[PDB]
């Protein structure tokens, strides 16, 4: 028997501003359904406190997608609209099973391309330095596929305990704070000026696994998004 995330108060504010995509982008449950007790192995309250996401398969997801609050439709904002767009979370990333290679846990996405992904990564070299079992940001600065279109940053090695995140977008600039420490300040987003379809996401989006059955698993102790 699985306990629903909505059975406690902690996540109601974000559930009131999200729909859930599972197991792919086009299959969704509404904010109303989430608030009404949506539950399953993919999305349940673990140990009385964690909004836990689980998903297997290449490019499959169990992921919240930002909505206008209070039964609203899909949100679309812009990096240069003047509003500060802020997402906060506290995440326990447990040990990922063999075959899971990258799990996107927070995003800024849009109708053109992902402006930002925060992901857990098993192993990667960045700017000449090898990192293992760590949290990375990937920012798009163009629409191409080569590495020149991205800025990738080692944010923090994965920790045993909960790790806090804050993503702030204001006036075409991005700041990321992890465990209270700034890890990216003033990253340019101006390529995306005028893109009015941006939105936050969070959960588990399974990227390039080497086994289709390996289940990615991510636990949120807190999640919120706000415009201010
Ligand atoms: O060394 C590198 O940086 C490796 O990057 C690989 O290309 C990445 C690309 O940089 C980026 O991470 C992209 O991200 C996509 C994501 O996985 C999801 O599919 C979706 O969110 O869309 C993202 C996007 O389009 O921005 O994924 C690719 C990738 O293949 O994983 C390769 O170039 C690799 O050879 C290289 O080592
Ligand atoms: Na765990």
mmCIF file of C-alpha atoms and ligand atoms in Angstrom:
data_model
loop_
_atom_site.group_PDB
_atom_site.id
_atom_site.type_symbol
_atom_site.label_atom_id
_atom_site.label_comp_id
_atom_site.label_asym_id
_atom_site.label_seq_id
_atom_site.Cartn_x
_atom_site.Cartn_y
_atom_site.Cartn_z
ATOM 1 C CA UNK A 1 0.000 0.000 0.000
ATOM 2 C CA UNK A 2 1.415 3.338 -1.124
ATOM 3 C CA UNK A 3 0.788 6.675 0.573
ATOM 4 C CA UNK A 4 -0.108 9.605 -1.684
ATOM 5 C CA UNK A 5 2.131 12.655 -1.822
ATOM 6 C CA UNK A 6 -0.956 14.871 -1.340
ATOM 7 C CA UNK A 7 -1.748 13.180 2.002
ATOM 8 C CA UNK A 8 0.565 15.645 3.795
ATOM 9 C CA UNK A 9 0.766 19.414 3.432
ATOM 10 C CA UNK A 10 4.413 19.759 2.374
ATOM 11 C CA UNK A 11 3.971 19.479 -1.404
ATOM 12 C CA UNK A 12 0.475 20.909 -1.863
ATOM 13 C CA UNK A 13 1.705 24.347 -3.018
ATOM 14 C CA UNK A 14 3.741 22.906 -5.876
ATOM 15 C CA UNK A 15 1.144 20.255 -6.749
ATOM 16 C CA UNK A 16 -1.321 23.163 -7.110
ATOM 17 C CA UNK A 17 1.067 24.513 -9.787
ATOM 18 C CA UNK A 18 2.020 21.343 -11.663
ATOM 19 C CA UNK A 19 0.858 18.491 -13.814
ATOM 20 C CA UNK A 20 2.676 15.130 -13.772
ATOM 21 C CA UNK A 21 4.035 13.517 -16.941
ATOM 22 C CA UNK A 22 4.491 9.756 -16.666
ATOM 23 C CA UNK A 23 5.920 7.624 -18.255
ATOM 24 C CA UNK A 24 6.433 10.054 -21.170
ATOM 25 C CA UNK A 25 5.835 13.735 -21.898
ATOM 26 C CA UNK A 26 2.513 13.219 -23.654
ATOM 27 C CA UNK A 27 0.861 11.140 -20.852
ATOM 28 C CA UNK A 28 -0.148 13.455 -18.029
ATOM 29 C CA UNK A 29 -2.187 13.751 -14.851
ATOM 30 C CA UNK A 30 -3.568 17.169 -13.993
ATOM 31 C CA UNK A 31 -2.903 19.315 -10.942
ATOM 32 C CA UNK A 32 -6.435 18.514 -9.771
ATOM 33 C CA UNK A 33 -5.650 14.784 -9.972
ATOM 34 C CA UNK A 34 -2.389 15.246 -8.055
ATOM 35 C CA UNK A 35 -4.160 17.205 -5.322
ATOM 36 C CA UNK A 36 -6.871 14.533 -5.303
ATOM 37 C CA UNK A 37 -4.565 11.736 -4.188
ATOM 38 C CA UNK A 38 -2.799 10.517 -7.326
ATOM 39 C CA UNK A 39 -0.403 7.758 -6.291
ATOM 40 C CA UNK A 40 1.518 4.856 -7.779
ATOM 41 C CA UNK A 41 4.930 3.207 -7.636
ATOM 42 C CA UNK A 42 6.152 5.996 -9.940
ATOM 43 C CA UNK A 43 5.098 8.803 -7.547
ATOM 44 C CA UNK A 44 4.435 8.234 -3.847
ATOM 45 C CA UNK A 45 5.297 9.486 -0.370
ATOM 46 C CA UNK A 46 8.338 7.590 0.892
ATOM 47 C CA UNK A 47 9.138 7.380 4.608
ATOM 48 C CA UNK A 48 6.381 9.836 5.409
ATOM 49 C CA UNK A 49 8.227 12.801 3.910
ATOM 50 C CA UNK A 50 9.694 12.295 0.408
ATOM 51 C CA UNK A 51 7.918 12.932 -2.873
ATOM 52 C CA UNK A 52 9.642 10.041 -4.637
ATOM 53 C CA UNK A 53 9.824 9.655 -8.419
ATOM 54 C CA UNK A 54 10.725 6.361 -10.153
ATOM 55 C CA UNK A 55 11.124 5.632 -13.867
ATOM 56 C CA UNK A 56 12.843 3.124 -16.160
ATOM 57 C CA UNK A 57 13.557 3.260 -19.877
ATOM 58 C CA UNK A 58 15.406 5.522 -22.300
ATOM 59 C CA UNK A 59 14.109 9.100 -22.154
ATOM 60 C CA UNK A 60 11.114 8.114 -20.048
ATOM 61 C CA UNK A 61 10.135 10.348 -17.158
ATOM 62 C CA UNK A 62 8.077 10.845 -14.056
ATOM 63 C CA UNK A 63 8.222 14.613 -13.917
ATOM 64 C CA UNK A 64 6.245 17.628 -12.743
ATOM 65 C CA UNK A 65 5.614 20.372 -15.308
ATOM 66 C CA UNK A 66 4.913 23.911 -14.069
ATOM 67 C CA UNK A 67 1.332 25.131 -14.453
ATOM 68 C CA UNK A 68 -0.406 28.385 -13.662
ATOM 69 C CA UNK A 69 -1.645 27.952 -10.060
ATOM 70 C CA UNK A 70 -5.173 27.080 -9.006
ATOM 71 C CA UNK A 71 -6.304 24.971 -11.934
ATOM 72 C CA UNK A 72 -4.610 27.119 -14.542
ATOM 73 C CA UNK A 73 -3.242 26.121 -17.900
ATOM 74 C CA UNK A 74 0.375 25.562 -18.957
ATOM 75 C CA UNK A 75 2.668 28.380 -17.937
ATOM 76 C CA UNK A 76 5.027 30.082 -20.327
ATOM 77 C CA UNK A 77 7.416 32.752 -19.106
ATOM 78 C CA UNK A 78 10.513 34.408 -20.518
ATOM 79 C CA UNK A 79 14.014 34.855 -19.187
ATOM 80 C CA UNK A 80 13.760 38.566 -20.040
ATOM 81 C CA UNK A 81 10.198 39.290 -18.894
ATOM 82 C CA UNK A 82 11.574 41.072 -15.810
ATOM 83 C CA UNK A 83 10.015 38.660 -13.318
ATOM 84 C CA UNK A 84 12.347 36.662 -11.110
ATOM 85 C CA UNK A 85 11.521 33.011 -11.699
ATOM 86 C CA UNK A 86 12.702 30.852 -8.804
ATOM 87 C CA UNK A 87 12.612 27.116 -8.181
ATOM 88 C CA UNK A 88 13.722 25.645 -4.865
ATOM 89 C CA UNK A 89 14.089 22.054 -3.765
ATOM 90 C CA UNK A 90 15.650 19.702 -1.270
ATOM 91 C CA UNK A 91 16.598 16.381 -2.867
ATOM 92 C CA UNK A 92 17.957 13.057 -1.655
ATOM 93 C CA UNK A 93 19.560 11.309 -4.609
ATOM 94 C CA UNK A 94 19.980 7.673 -3.494
ATOM 95 C CA UNK A 95 22.476 5.330 -5.100
ATOM 96 C CA UNK A 96 21.380 4.768 -8.693
ATOM 97 C CA UNK A 97 21.238 1.177 -9.890
ATOM 98 C CA UNK A 98 23.436 -0.191 -12.646
ATOM 99 C CA UNK A 99 22.298 0.949 -16.058
ATOM 100 C CA UNK A 100 21.184 4.392 -14.885
ATOM 101 C CA UNK A 101 23.699 6.901 -16.293
ATOM 102 C CA UNK A 102 22.081 10.360 -16.069
ATOM 103 C CA UNK A 103 18.894 11.508 -14.337
ATOM 104 C CA UNK A 104 17.542 14.999 -14.898
ATOM 105 C CA UNK A 105 16.023 16.224 -11.633
ATOM 106 C CA UNK A 106 15.186 19.897 -12.339
ATOM 107 C CA UNK A 107 14.769 21.805 -15.598
ATOM 108 C CA UNK A 108 13.940 25.018 -17.295
ATOM 109 C CA UNK A 109 12.343 23.837 -20.521
ATOM 110 C CA UNK A 110 10.499 25.625 -23.289
ATOM 111 C CA UNK A 111 8.881 25.118 -26.631
ATOM 112 C CA UNK A 112 12.288 25.333 -28.326
ATOM 113 C CA UNK A 113 14.955 23.527 -26.298
ATOM 114 C CA UNK A 114 15.901 23.007 -22.632
ATOM 115 C CA UNK A 115 17.479 26.150 -21.266
ATOM 116 C CA UNK A 116 18.701 24.298 -18.180
ATOM 117 C CA UNK A 117 18.935 20.777 -16.854
ATOM 118 C CA UNK A 118 20.227 19.858 -13.417
ATOM 119 C CA UNK A 119 21.118 16.177 -13.540
ATOM 120 C CA UNK A 120 22.796 13.426 -11.611
ATOM 121 C CA UNK A 121 25.626 11.941 -13.715
ATOM 122 C CA UNK A 122 27.478 8.675 -13.131
ATOM 123 C CA UNK A 123 30.819 9.658 -14.715
ATOM 124 C CA UNK A 124 32.004 12.560 -16.878
ATOM 125 C CA UNK A 125 35.057 14.666 -17.630
ATOM 126 C CA UNK A 126 34.443 18.424 -17.631
ATOM 127 C CA UNK A 127 37.138 20.872 -18.742
ATOM 128 C CA UNK A 128 39.892 18.322 -18.180
ATOM 129 C CA UNK A 129 38.696 17.076 -14.772
ATOM 130 C CA UNK A 130 37.045 13.711 -14.196
ATOM 131 C CA UNK A 131 34.024 13.676 -11.902
ATOM 132 C CA UNK A 132 31.998 10.745 -10.562
ATOM 133 C CA UNK A 133 28.550 10.351 -9.020
ATOM 134 C CA UNK A 134 27.779 14.056 -9.132
ATOM 135 C CA UNK A 135 25.241 16.775 -9.857
ATOM 136 C CA UNK A 136 25.733 18.802 -13.041
ATOM 137 C CA UNK A 137 24.121 21.774 -14.739
ATOM 138 C CA UNK A 138 23.712 21.860 -18.520
ATOM 139 C CA UNK A 139 22.790 25.268 -19.963
ATOM 140 C CA UNK A 140 22.018 25.768 -23.634
ATOM 141 C CA UNK A 141 23.563 28.791 -25.335
ATOM 142 C CA UNK A 142 22.394 27.724 -28.817
ATOM 143 C CA UNK A 143 20.170 25.233 -30.625
ATOM 144 C CA UNK A 144 22.850 23.001 -32.164
ATOM 145 C CA UNK A 145 23.985 19.591 -30.962
ATOM 146 C CA UNK A 146 27.752 20.028 -30.610
ATOM 147 C CA UNK A 147 29.339 20.767 -27.242
ATOM 148 C CA UNK A 148 29.760 24.457 -28.144
ATOM 149 C CA UNK A 149 25.983 24.824 -27.664
ATOM 150 C CA UNK A 150 26.184 23.995 -23.955
ATOM 151 C CA UNK A 151 27.816 25.096 -20.732
ATOM 152 C CA UNK A 152 28.216 22.158 -18.355
ATOM 153 C CA UNK A 153 29.274 22.659 -14.741
ATOM 154 C CA UNK A 154 30.086 20.344 -11.852
ATOM 155 C CA UNK A 155 27.811 21.620 -9.074
ATOM 156 C CA UNK A 156 28.487 19.146 -6.267
ATOM 157 C CA UNK A 157 29.275 15.508 -5.696
ATOM 158 C CA UNK A 158 26.215 13.498 -4.679
ATOM 159 C CA UNK A 159 25.714 13.568 -0.914
ATOM 160 C CA UNK A 160 24.305 11.031 1.493
ATOM 161 C CA UNK A 161 21.892 13.613 2.899
ATOM 162 C CA UNK A 162 19.413 16.010 1.382
ATOM 163 C CA UNK A 163 20.880 18.608 -0.950
ATOM 164 C CA UNK A 164 19.180 21.963 -1.420
ATOM 165 C CA UNK A 165 18.861 23.740 -4.751
ATOM 166 C CA UNK A 166 17.764 27.186 -5.803
ATOM 167 C CA UNK A 167 17.468 28.245 -9.437
ATOM 168 C CA UNK A 168 16.944 31.975 -10.069
ATOM 169 C CA UNK A 169 16.302 33.547 -13.470
ATOM 170 C CA UNK A 170 16.117 37.330 -13.718
ATOM 171 C CA UNK A 171 16.859 39.695 -16.598
ATOM 172 C CA UNK A 172 18.349 37.009 -18.830
ATOM 173 C CA UNK A 173 20.748 35.712 -16.160
ATOM 174 C CA UNK A 174 20.834 32.436 -14.242
ATOM 175 C CA UNK A 175 22.089 31.761 -10.727
ATOM 176 C CA UNK A 176 22.239 28.287 -9.167
ATOM 177 C CA UNK A 177 22.787 27.727 -5.442
ATOM 178 C CA UNK A 178 23.441 24.254 -3.987
ATOM 179 C CA UNK A 179 23.422 23.657 -0.220
ATOM 180 C CA UNK A 180 23.407 27.431 0.182
ATOM 181 C CA UNK A 181 26.579 27.888 -1.909
ATOM 182 C CA UNK A 182 26.511 29.700 -5.229
ATOM 183 C CA UNK A 183 27.791 27.365 -7.936
ATOM 184 C CA UNK A 184 26.748 29.421 -11.017
ATOM 185 C CA UNK A 185 26.291 33.204 -10.976
ATOM 186 C CA UNK A 186 25.078 35.355 -13.802
ATOM 187 C CA UNK A 187 25.145 32.747 -16.542
ATOM 188 C CA UNK A 188 23.851 34.366 -19.707
ATOM 189 C CA UNK A 189 20.460 33.263 -21.027
ATOM 190 C CA UNK A 190 20.059 36.083 -23.566
ATOM 191 C CA UNK A 191 20.034 33.652 -26.511
ATOM 192 C CA UNK A 192 16.556 32.855 -25.163
ATOM 193 C CA UNK A 193 15.370 36.475 -24.990
ATOM 194 C CA UNK A 194 11.844 36.609 -26.337
ATOM 195 C CA UNK A 195 11.200 32.872 -25.863
ATOM 196 C CA UNK A 196 7.901 33.167 -23.982
ATOM 197 C CA UNK A 197 7.299 29.442 -23.448
ATOM 198 C CA UNK A 198 9.699 28.658 -20.590
ATOM 199 C CA UNK A 199 8.642 26.667 -17.545
ATOM 200 C CA UNK A 200 10.140 24.739 -14.655
ATOM 201 C CA UNK A 201 10.145 20.962 -14.295
ATOM 202 C CA UNK A 202 11.325 18.597 -11.567
ATOM 203 C CA UNK A 203 11.295 14.874 -10.851
ATOM 204 C CA UNK A 204 13.141 12.119 -12.701
ATOM 205 C CA UNK A 205 13.889 12.101 -16.429
ATOM 206 C CA UNK A 206 16.087 9.155 -17.412
ATOM 207 C CA UNK A 207 18.762 10.062 -19.993
ATOM 208 C CA UNK A 208 20.838 7.551 -21.978
ATOM 209 C CA UNK A 209 20.518 4.491 -19.701
ATOM 210 C CA UNK A 210 22.456 1.367 -20.637
ATOM 211 C CA UNK A 211 19.620 -0.897 -19.447
ATOM 212 C CA UNK A 212 15.973 -0.323 -20.303
ATOM 213 C CA UNK A 213 14.766 -1.978 -17.087
ATOM 214 C CA UNK A 214 16.976 -0.059 -14.635
ATOM 215 C CA UNK A 215 14.782 2.221 -12.531
ATOM 216 C CA UNK A 216 15.974 5.740 -11.726
ATOM 217 C CA UNK A 217 14.796 6.948 -8.318
ATOM 218 C CA UNK A 218 14.865 10.481 -6.869
ATOM 219 C CA UNK A 219 13.443 11.726 -3.536
ATOM 220 C CA UNK A 220 12.258 15.306 -2.941
ATOM 221 C CA UNK A 221 11.956 16.585 0.624
ATOM 222 C CA UNK A 222 10.790 19.969 -0.704
ATOM 223 C CA UNK A 223 9.923 21.578 -4.025
ATOM 224 C CA UNK A 224 8.469 24.977 -4.871
ATOM 225 C CA UNK A 225 8.319 27.387 -7.753
ATOM 226 C CA UNK A 226 7.460 31.081 -7.599
ATOM 227 C CA UNK A 227 7.354 34.178 -9.767
ATOM 228 C CA UNK A 228 8.207 37.377 -7.955
HETATM 229 O O1 LIG B 1 30.935 15.613 -23.752
HETATM 230 C C1 LIG B 1 29.714 15.898 -23.788
HETATM 231 O O2 LIG B 1 29.320 17.007 -23.350
HETATM 232 C C2 LIG B 1 28.748 14.867 -24.273
HETATM 233 O O3 LIG B 1 27.504 15.539 -24.666
HETATM 234 C C3 LIG B 1 26.595 14.678 -25.478
HETATM 235 O O4 LIG B 1 25.506 15.442 -25.998
HETATM 236 C C4 LIG B 1 24.500 15.730 -25.025
HETATM 237 C C5 LIG B 1 24.203 17.195 -24.986
HETATM 238 O O5 LIG B 1 25.388 17.894 -24.581
HETATM 239 C C6 LIG B 1 23.094 17.508 -24.042
HETATM 240 O O6 LIG B 1 23.420 17.059 -22.713
HETATM 241 C C7 LIG B 1 21.847 16.812 -24.504
HETATM 242 O O7 LIG B 1 20.802 16.964 -23.557
HETATM 243 C C8 LIG B 1 19.501 16.494 -24.007
HETATM 244 C C9 LIG B 1 18.991 15.584 -22.941
HETATM 245 O O8 LIG B 1 19.815 14.375 -22.756
HETATM 246 C C10 LIG B 1 17.585 15.171 -23.187
HETATM 247 O O9 LIG B 1 17.564 14.272 -24.278
HETATM 248 C C11 LIG B 1 16.659 16.378 -23.484
HETATM 249 O O10 LIG B 1 16.550 17.024 -22.373
HETATM 250 O O11 LIG B 1 17.272 17.269 -24.578
HETATM 251 C C12 LIG B 1 18.605 17.691 -24.171
HETATM 252 C C13 LIG B 1 19.033 18.719 -25.197
HETATM 253 O O12 LIG B 1 18.720 18.563 -26.398
HETATM 254 O O13 LIG B 1 19.653 19.731 -24.796
HETATM 255 O O14 LIG B 1 22.098 15.375 -24.648
HETATM 256 C C14 LIG B 1 23.244 14.991 -25.451
HETATM 257 C C15 LIG B 1 23.469 13.530 -25.272
HETATM 258 O O15 LIG B 1 23.761 12.822 -26.271
HETATM 259 O O16 LIG B 1 23.374 13.033 -24.117
HETATM 260 C C16 LIG B 1 27.313 14.019 -26.641
HETATM 261 O O17 LIG B 1 27.722 15.047 -27.572
HETATM 262 C C17 LIG B 1 28.481 13.244 -26.153
HETATM 263 O O18 LIG B 1 29.167 12.657 -27.283
HETATM 264 C C18 LIG B 1 29.443 14.107 -25.400
HETATM 265 O O19 LIG B 1 30.469 13.294 -24.827
HETATM 266 NA NA1 LIG B 2 16.606 6.043 -0.220
#
